[PDB]
Amino acid sequence: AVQLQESGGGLVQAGGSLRLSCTVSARTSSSHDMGWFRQAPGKEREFVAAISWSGGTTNYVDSVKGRFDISKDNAKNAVYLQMNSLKPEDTAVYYCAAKWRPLRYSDNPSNSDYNYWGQGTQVTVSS
């Protein structure tokens, strides 16, 4: 199993920024995709962004392209979501997640059917 724990979060004025971090169990192998998902109360969970833990290829949900940036630091077992240009629509509980992936040619990370989940962190965007 891979364990994950979010840090960062809180309240930010619209237009502002916030970074989320996700700490990853230290002996996690390279054969994974890391991702961020979010869920607002009343709504279904939705994919936000993902990064291949081995190759660094990224993918984003359309509504955050150009605003959020996902990155990783394998040496520190960390994943990050830099949230810029925050909009009221972005208010949600954000979850770190990981998915085991076999070796392959295409490095493009998955956006669904993740295996391992953090406990979530609330991000609230005001005005």
- Across-strand partners of 32? 100
- Across-strand partners of 72? 79
Q: Cβ distance 88 to 123 under 8 Å?
A: no
Q: Cβ distance 9 to 105 under 8 Å?
A: no
- Residue 123 to residues 29, 33, 39, 74, 112, Cα–Cα distance (Å): 29, 23, 10, 25, 22
Domains of the chain (ranges plus CATH)? Answer: 1-127 (2.60.40.10)
Q: Cβ distance 117 to 97 under 8 Å?
A: yes
- Across-strand partners of 11? 124
Collapsing DSSP to helix, strand or coil, 12 comes out as: strand
- Give the 3-state DSSP-derived string for 20-46, with helices as H, strands as E and coil as C: EEEEECCCCCCCEEEEEEEECCCCCCE
- How many CA within 13 A on the CB side of residue 77? 12
**CA–CA gap between residue 41 and residue 12 (Å, rounded):** 18
Elucidation method: X-ray
Biggest CA pair distance of the chain: 45
Task: Tell me how crowded residue 53 is: count the other CB atoms within 10 A of its CB.
Answer: 24
